[PDB]
Design a protein around this ligand. Structure first.
Ligand SMILES: [Ca+2]
Ligand SMILES: [Ca+2]
Ligand SMILES: [Ca+2]
Ligand SMILES: [Ca+2]
Ligand code: NA
Lengths: 595, 595
């Protein structure tokens, strides 16, 4: 898919290059594809995309800055200071000084300005300024510039939110996931309406049924208290604890709570999952259609490069001239659609990639035997039934890397999803030879490759193959969940920071103190992230909700936890379930086509 | 579907009857259908099926006997006796005396012997004694007869297990569910192999990683302790509790447990659900195919009754003679397959059932207004903003019942799934007029019918329609889970009965005593059932496992809880999820066909 062919080649080379780009799934921007003299514009797009590692590193740096900033409650002079990390149950990451924060922010903003305005080199000015994505990015960069300036000048801070928005906007798969999700929201709010109606009605029955009982006197003291407890019971997290007083008062009370939990989980929760799954399928189909339209647009541009006369036809003397530039550089008359069908058929049957310029099958057996020997060595070493053996295996693994990159070349080697990981962990190993036991886990991280041999076992092939394909293909969804946690974390540290401290005295009544959860707090960004992970797992989750309700003295604090549950569990994790199921069924159909 | 027509009719009436049976989904047994005589054999089958209510009541009585038997540990003379129900934290159901047990068992066994041997009236002797189902039923009844005799004579008791097996064998949909499940088991044990391999490897890494830490010294003290804790963490039920000492030692420890829980839940649990779902689909397809073969066999014997000359043929005079006996009672040559296609097409496009022997839409509006008025009356009554009003509404509801059974006749009325429930709750209401405040809940149980009006709201139609169809169609699966719970309950009372008592002294160290769960014990069958419900809900489920491990002093006790988790949660509840999802998608496709 050579940039040089697109930039400089004769039209037949440009056509073959656009074809290989399209069927490798890479679209040139329409702002380039729609113009005649596109080569000089494309020149800049390729130098832009050559720098993707620099831009990606800048975005991950900008996002990770949130983990190293001092909490705002520490700036407003607490007694004692946040140097007393044990008094405030804080984490172990350093807090950047003002000087360090200024340096970090200035550097990352300068690279962000370059990345955001450089597209005006290949898009034109009017084309640039009319893109909605560019306008939103310019708004984000100007907000970060003003936020930098207004503290280089030296009740809340905006920057951490804008950094997460910039990160979302800078990864195509995350933008795509949010566009997909925006199509699901309309149908999601309907079933939330029915779920609320269910909770309200079940809570009304429960309230009027227990009003003068011990359950009434001690748990269901009001309709709001009932609705709160019944909401937590929908999650099952407070079962059976919430209805023990009823069961002590009468064993028949268990029938009500049995019916409630049975209906709430096995009917209502599964139907919410089903609604989310159907909507996800509809939006994914719409996305794949859009990608097919991109592919067709590129193939039509290729035909518009070969046809310079606009008669809409190419002859066999042109067609063989394209067929060479395809079948030996990347792998009757024809018309605009016939070309697209013929080429996608070539992409089906004949298409196997040629190797770039500049290995035996049993070599895989040799390295598999070596890494199983290494595994049995590691086990007999841990049970204490050798640094020179760990050295000689590390040497063999770097020798394998060097041999494979020599025989195939890195531009061919690095294409495989496996060997790029083997390369990464081998590099981390050899740079670990800085002269502990941590190399044990790196070599076993290589040993994990042995699990691919279970794809030879037909009863396991589908499972292992789906797990392997899921590792990369879930990253957009897991990353969207991660960005949602980052926003909720910044809110939590803004609204709850400093309340969990060793002098609070109310804290030691709060259940957070009784369950020993005091390190899972919102005093710091990493603390908030691990707390939000515990919330996402739903294990004991209402402990934090009830404790921060006590510590803040307001029921409005529960809006945080309720909204977090409604967004992340009932929607995003159900989306993950749907995605895993659809991936597995796709694998079974692929095997049913292989056989 | 007239039994008179099958038993006595002219062959054209027999043919029309067999057709209406087959297309209403009722199969005569093959032992009749192939008998070459629908006479005296069919006569007895219809009186047999006329008695279905008596048999069903006998089977439910036989199953429920388990809830009223004295636990065997009470018979072996405890001090104090089980009359001290508080000392043993017992339930509220009575225990039958020996005389009552003998009477109950003798009566139920007599009706069971009748039901099990009466088929030899229409099946022949050799046909009866070669049926595998009959032989298993005869083995069960002879075991119950021995177990009765061996205590009418006056280490464990077998009867409670055989009663559950008899109940499974006596309901067709439960036999169907078990034969379906037997097809899934092979593929289920494969993914259990990978799940165990995942637990063992993750637990080995965790063990060697923490060995000299506080996590090692206090939680991961051995490989077996690690594997046990990591298995509970796979359930999430001990998150974050299990790894707080690691997090106190180093915050980076959280990354291990985050990755473990992320992989274990969102990859492994979802792929187990996917495997179960695919296997369920394959087995349900095999079931529907068998039902279609039954339908075809019935249509082919209908043809074999019309073509009693074995022409291979029916002529137009015969065909219109059948056509009258069909279209005037129950809703050009032709051949064996053409008949079946034509009739099934008539069922699809033309059939609409006639009323049996012996109403305007505004009546539905009137009763909807009356029940909404009743609802606003109930709400304003409970908030205390009338027994004569509750009486007059109860009268209106019984007058509606009597009017509808008059206008349509009970044989037509009772066919709807809705009005048979309305009839039941109205009868329970009017027999409740024994003169109480509890009738509020029965009238609101009628008020629940108002939710059907949300099917008129297109954004809610599929959800409500699927919920309504799920109410009956999940009963075989929920009932299979109930039978599994019954067997586990009987085992639990056998092995754990009497250990939770106020004199145990070890109990008050056991977490069961600290969480206040002492009423959730295995001292009694209803206590066991509610305990196993709490286990099925997975809320705090490891409390019982760890407490009974401590009370029994052996790790072998955990086999009970582990096997219960593996059977019920990873298989049967995933089956319920698959069933609900497939039902929803079927509803969306139905609406997509109707719109
Ligand atoms: Ca700032
Ligand atoms: Ca009351
Ligand atoms: Ca017995
Ligand atoms: Ca160590
Ligand atoms: Na807990």
């Amino acid at each position: 898919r050579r940039s040089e062919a697109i930039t400089h080649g004769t039209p037949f080379q440009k056509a073959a290059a656009l074809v290989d780009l399209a069927e490798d799934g890479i679209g040139l921007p329409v702002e380039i594809l729609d113009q005649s003299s596109f080569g000089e514009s494309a020149r800049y797009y390729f130098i832009f995309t050559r720098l993707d590692l620099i831009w990606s590193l800048n975005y991950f740096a900008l996002l990770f800055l949130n983990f190293f900033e001092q909490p705002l409650w520490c700036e407003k002079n607490p007694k004692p200071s946040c140097k007393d990390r044990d008094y405030y149950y804080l984490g172990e990451l350093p807090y950047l000084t003002n000087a360090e924060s200024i340096i970090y922010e200035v550097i990352t903003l300068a690279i962000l300005l370059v990345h955001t305005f450089f597209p005006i080199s290949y898009e034109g000015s009017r084309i640039f300024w009319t893109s909605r994505l560019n306008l939103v990015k310019v708004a984000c960069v100007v907000i970060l510039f003003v936020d930098v300036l207004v503290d280089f000048l030296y009740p809340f801070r905006i920057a951490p939110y804008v950094r997460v928005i910039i990160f979302i906007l800078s990864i195509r798969e995350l933008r795509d996931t949010l566009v997909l999700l925006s199509g699901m929201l309309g149908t999601y709010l309907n079933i939330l309406a029915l779920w609320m109606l269910f909770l309200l009605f079940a809570s009304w029955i429960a309230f009027v049924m227990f009003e003068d009982t011990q359950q009434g006197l001690t748990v269901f003291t009001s309709y709001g208290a009932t609705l709160y407890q019944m909401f937590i019971l929908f999650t099952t997290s407070n079962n059976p604890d919430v209805w023990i007083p009823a069961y002590k008062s009468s064993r028949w009370s268990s029938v009500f709570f049995v019916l409630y939990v049975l209906i709430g989980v096995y009917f209502v929760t599964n139907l919410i999952l089903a609604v989310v799954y159907d909507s996800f399928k509809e939006q994914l189909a719409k996305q794949v259609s859009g990608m097919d339209q991109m592919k067709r647009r590129m193939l039509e541009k290729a035909f518009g490069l070969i046809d310079s006369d606009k008669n809409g036809e190419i002859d066999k003397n042109q067609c063989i001239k394209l067929f060479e530039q395809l079948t030996n550089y990347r792998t009757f008359k024809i018309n605009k659609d016939e070309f697209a069908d013929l080429c996608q058929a070539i992409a089906l049957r004949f298409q196997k990639e040629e190797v770039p310029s500049l290995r035996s099958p049993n070599f895989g057996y040799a390295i598999s035997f070596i890494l199983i020997i290494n595994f049995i060595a590691v086990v007999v070493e841990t049970t204490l039934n050798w640094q020179v053996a760990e050295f000689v295996f590390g040497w063999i693994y770097v020798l394998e890397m060097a041999l494979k990159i020599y025989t195939y070349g890195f531009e061919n080697y690095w294409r495989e999803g496996a060997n790029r990981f083997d390369f990464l962990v081998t590099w981390v190993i050899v740079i670990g030879e800085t002269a502990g036991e941590w190399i044990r886990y790196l070599l076993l991280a290589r040993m994990l490759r042995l699990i691919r041999l279970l794809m030879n076992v037909q009863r396991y092939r589908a499972f292992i193959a789906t797990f392997i394909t899921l590792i990369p293909s879930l990253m957009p969804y897991l990353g969207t969940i991660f960005c949602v946690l980052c926003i909720y974390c910044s809110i939590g540290v803004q609204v709850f920071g400093g309340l969990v401290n060793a002098g609070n005295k109310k804290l030691f009544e709060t259940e957070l103190a009784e369950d020993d959860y005091l390190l899972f707090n919102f005093n710091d960004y990493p603390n908030g992230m691990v707390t939000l992970f515990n919330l996402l797992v739903m294990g004991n989750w209402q402990v934090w909700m009830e404790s921060y309700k006590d510590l803040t003295g307001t029921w409005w604090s529960i809006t945080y936890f309720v909204s977090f549950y409604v967004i992340t569990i009932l929607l995003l994790l159900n989306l993950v379930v749907a995605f895993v199921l659809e991936a597995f069924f796709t694998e079974l159909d692929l095997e049913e086509e292989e056989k």
